[model samples]
Target: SAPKETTPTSTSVQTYVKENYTAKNGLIVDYKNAQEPHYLAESIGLYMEYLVEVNDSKTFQEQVSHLEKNFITEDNFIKWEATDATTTNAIVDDFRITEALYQASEKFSFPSYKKMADKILANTKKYSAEQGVPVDFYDFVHKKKADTLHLSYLNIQAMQQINYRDKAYLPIQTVNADPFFTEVFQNEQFQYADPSEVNMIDQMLIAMAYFDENGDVEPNFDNFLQTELASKGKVYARYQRETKKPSSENESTAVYAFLTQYFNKTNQAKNGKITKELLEKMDTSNPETTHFFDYINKEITLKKKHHHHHH
Candidate 1:
């Protein structure tokens, strides 16, 4: 056994998520505070990814079954949100689940996982590919597509696994040589996506995707991240593009979760220290935070299993 469920913090949060957010239908509900119970592919895709990582094939099968039963559309698209009657597919979440299934097919030795992944990758490419790069979402219902790509949604790791390779996986330079990345792009033009303030969660996720594609972090962003963790011991919630300083005081567990995985992949020392810090600050009452905290725990569990080998 991998001891994935034996860790105290991860087990607690995992139990919380199962007891509270997991519905009778086997899909994860998006929020605990919502009036009628909400569902987003955002929640399902990530959890399914986590489940696959931990080799919890039983739960993974249940979620996949739920997707086939209630989520997948007539044309084989997974709807972005299940709270509504009709909706589009988020390319990010679509690929997230596809990535999970792709890994599951190999990890669990189940060929059907890849068979289903092939279907999704084909449909996603048909609808989401614009010019040469995949966009944010495809409104499969109306047969429409989004023109802007949220940089965080790129998910180079997942895209690459299904044989997707493009310059869109390349990292963009920020204005004035800022260490942070641009958050959105005009899909047709591949222009910088903007906001006066950027969340570190989105910024770090994009960095992870870039690293995932290239096996290295964008050097400058890695320096910025290293400095932040070394000096402050925690990452900030948001940033203003105009300055290197953070614009907010809030520390998010989700941000640390991404950072933990990012650091693990880069083979950085003190990754364990950041994991400890996140566990200390983790707020279990918030639904999103626990999922994130537990999610990163999977990455640690991963390195543990593979530590005997060289990276």
Candidate 2:
């Protein structure tokens, strides 16, 4: 049976968001850090996207209005952190915000949101484009690209908006062959060498979910999954890449979310079943907070049921 969507229980992620992150004024804070309280464009954007998925457009608009009022600079780029004390812009942050606005515009028939999205898209193309790839950051105040370049922050997810709005905006050749995947998969084993950071794995999984063709599951991805599960029953937040072991849950949920998406996309029934079982085990510790996992499981089950019914 499909779980009824309602106000989540006390320990649920929704409750957590409401109680901890939501300010008295209704704006969602970037994080729970007491020392340096601030709002992040990235956080607001992503949270709004999530709320939309869960059919909470009322709250979504509130957060969006807050962001538009406080974060939008004179030139229209979202400030990375909406604090009078600091000023900067990240390509990823703006990308996320633009994507959220695009989503909201489509879902709610709001042309204004679409217009803002177009403006953000134009600014992103003007400032963040580095030899056809997105750079890490840009100085909103100075109107120049920043000195750092991290491919991981490329915001490939934003490509959905670009493709939807302006087909010719991004070069076809660049989109055809992504350097990010090329660099990450160079080893063929699908293992990132950096032990200090395991986020690449999650990022790779997300990219695969987006890009992998039907029935084109890469062998390396399966190997990577098997290796990870061999050591720990559940995925870790960060692990030593060399050891193929669990090193470090919030992140693990994200990994499983992407993993589940990839498996469903490819129709890999076995991997899908395995991932659901693991997700269930992980979620058992606290079902309230793990509603996201429940949502994933529901989707997977619904897909499987549909597949079975059709056949």
Candidate 3:
């Protein structure tokens, strides 16, 4: 094994994203679940983190190079998506890329990676609102921004590096009985981005954000998740806003993917059964689904600490 060599993970999602989704400009592009072919900051950012976790410097550098060459705008903001339709800065996705690069720089002792993150965040500061609270995104073309900042979109730890003030959206909220976080906080009030139901991915991300800032899940939500997982063995995909009932029609691989991290963070015993369930429901039919879920699904093995090895 040579220094910085890529170790063999026979069925690695890393290889899949590289071989299947790498675009003409070397960015990760979606093959399905789109109105047209497009590259997302989300996918690129996530895969960069995956590379960092797996310690693949060569592949990680490839993403960093491609991103610098194509995704960056003349004005200095990282464009959220690479498509003819629109090019705006999505704050959450943008932060993930910067944060990944920052993490990579320290892990690999690569000075330039840190400089790249510094450049991105300097420009990213323009996206912040009154409290230096990051907006959901910025539309640089027309010099505009989406008014409502989705709580789930805020990366609390990343923003701290920029010296931005949070405390804008605090006191974790639950709109429904099952402990659902509110969607967006703006204009001095809370509003729903999805008015009628709760999506578990967003809910869980909010829980993650809460845990990061406040140090734990909303007690009932924690118990709700525990009770549901213990009883049903699977978390529901969505819940009704009015009834607080879980939707039964379809489950989300992304949700399970996030759950593995959430459960790991919150310290609950989750195992191969969850992975087995993900494998059972894994649908590679949609390239977008395949790439996104597959990359996140890799977290099962990539997490830094085991916390438990099947108890």
Candidate 4:
């Protein structure tokens, strides 16, 4: 009699790996759930293209097309420029003005917009050339050198006021976050400290504010009370916990200590001493600061108070 033969029920990467590789490495490749890595890789590749085209393009038309395809698209390429008409038109119009550099080669004629953007670019170019800067300085610096000289033209066009529909994955330039933060981070800031430090601080603070304290960094006392302790009892109870601890020695002291250490490490890396002046300048205690605090307090106070009473 022939030896009995058994057939496997499935044929997949997982099946092969289980039959052959699992005993050797204790690992199996699951092709069915292996999509995230591909998505992430493509997302990163598209973003790189978006950055290159937005910052480095020589002509306005080129930049606009590049951004439309790579960064800010309507639904897809089928519509060309349909959804989010306002933002799309704004981008196109701005690019058309920039393209006037090519259109009017000799006299530097102004291009049309709310105000004459080409005239503004031309005037700036004239001044810059007179001051011994390159005529293509605007594009060259913003593109290659990543400088802030382009801000003058950008500001005149109310570039900062531009808004988009889907902003989460929008290009850094179009995102409403501060360009100052971008320039500082790209050119000067990260040169001294760990590039991930700012994100780390933000993530920790947000986690604390959201009452999800199980993170790498601990929250400050006030944040802890608002998030973690607010559920336990009255506001007074949490405030008492915060006030009773010594400033120098407390669970929340790690917050500032981490910041100080971060700053010190950055300065040391740059072979420069961290100064109090820089700290003072970066301190968040202006009218704007107070306004944000008041806004948050008003928004969350009623909910928190209700939760405290209910518990």
The lDDT per prediction is 0.68, 0.55, 0.70, 0.25
Better of 1 and 3 by TM-score: 3
The 10 consecutive residues of candidate 2 with the worst lDDT sum are 171-180
Name the lDDT value of residue 240 in candidate 1: 71
What is the number of backbone collisions in each predicted candidate, taken in the order shown?
1, 0, 0, 0
Model 3, span 176-264: residue lDDT tens:
32466677777756777677798887887787777777776677667777777777777878988777778665677667777676777
Question: Distance from true position, residue 125, model 3, in Å?
Answer: 2.7
Alpha carbon deviation, residue 130, candidate 2 (Å): 1.7
**TM-score of each candidate?**
0.82, 0.69, 0.84, 0.17
Model 3 lDDT on a 0 to 1 scale: 0.70
Ranked candidates, highest TM-score first: 3, 1, 2, 4
- Maximum-TM-score candidate: 3
After TM-score superposition, the amount by which residue 90's alpha carbon in candidate 1 deviates from its true location, in angstroms, is 1.0
lDDT digits (tens) for residues 1-311 of candidate 2: 11123331122445666766666666556444445555667667767666555555566677777887888878777788777654567776787778777877766656787787888877776676554445556676666675444334455557555642332123211222111232222211232335344564445443563343222544554556655556555555554445544455334554665566666666766776776676555542343343333343333333332257785
Where does candidate 1 clash, by residue pair?
Answer: 184-193
Query: What shift in Å separates residue 5 of candidate 4 from its native position after superposition?
Result: 66
TM-score of 3: 0.84
